Structure formats: C-alpha cells, structure tokens
Amino acid sequence: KLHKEPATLIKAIDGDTVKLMYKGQPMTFRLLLVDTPEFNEKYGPEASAFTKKMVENAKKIEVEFDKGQRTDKYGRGLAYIYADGKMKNEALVRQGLAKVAYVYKGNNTHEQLLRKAEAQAKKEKLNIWS
C-alpha cells in the first residue's frame, strides 16, 4: 500500500514533469512509469497542454511515492501525481499522450493499471497511436 501526501502547484513544466511545493520545499517531479514526447516532438505540445490544464485546474494536488527510489539522478522527485483524485500518469497514457516507459523493478506498483490504459488508448488509435 502507498499513501497520498499533500503538495501545491508551483508551475507546469511539460507533459511529464511539474514543479510542486512538497513538505514546504520547491521540487521538480517526474511522473513514474510514463514518457511523453518532448515539447519539440510530435504530440509534445498536446502532452504539455494536457498536464498543464490538469494541474492548474485542480483544487487538490497529491503526491504518491512508490516503494523504491523517490528521487532520480537529476534530483527530480519520482511519484504518481493526483489532481482532484485523478492520476495524471494514468490519464496521459489513457489519452495516448504518453507511452508506458521506464519501468524499473520496485518502483512499479501501478504498472498493470497503466498498461491497461495504454492498451485501450492503442485500441482507440488515440494521438500517439494514430
């Protein structure tokens, strides 16, 4: 079992990174288990727009760390991020705006949930799968 913790928005960055205040400190978070296109790539802008809209409209942002590493080699927090109870990581995949990616042993709790969303986005031919 994982736990949701509070955080507040500082600023949207791109499809799979965001700046949040967590335990009172500014931190850039990278979303576990996904990969969005870079802003400069196809669907990059749409991914960035999606994440921005989702976080900027939320009344309540939460951070959920997995079992394993909580920061990556660049000092980014590694988390599942929720906006008003909806997971951003899963939402991007379900929409065909991210691929399931970077699945490392022991930070992979929600792997099967996200693959199931990817299968459905691919069936629908959405965005990246179009």
Which residues lie below 8 Å from residue 19, measured CB to CB, with a gap of 6+?
9, 10, 11, 12, 13, 26, 27, 28, 29
Residues sharing a CB contact under 8 Å with residue 41, sequence separation 6 or more, in sequence order: none
Instruction: Choose the contact partner of 72 out of Ca ion, ligand THP, none; CB within 5 to 8 A by kind.
Output: ligand THP
Asked if 32 is part of the footprint of ligand THP (rule: CB under 6 A), the reply reads yes
64 interacts with ligand THP by CB under 6 A: no
How far is the C-alpha of 58 from the C-alpha of 69, rounded, in Å?
26
Choose one: 41-49, 72-80, 92-100, 118-126; the region binding ligand THP (CB under 6 A).
72-80
* Residue 111, CA distances (Å) to 17, 54, 63, 96 in order: 19, 21, 17, 16
Among 20, 27, 30, 83, binds ligand THP (CB under 6 A): 30
Does position 99 bind ligand THP by CB under 6 A? no
Q: Is 35 in the site for ligand THP (CB under 6 A)?
A: yes
- The residues binding ligand THP (CB under 6 A) are 30, 32, 35, 72-73, 78, 102, 104
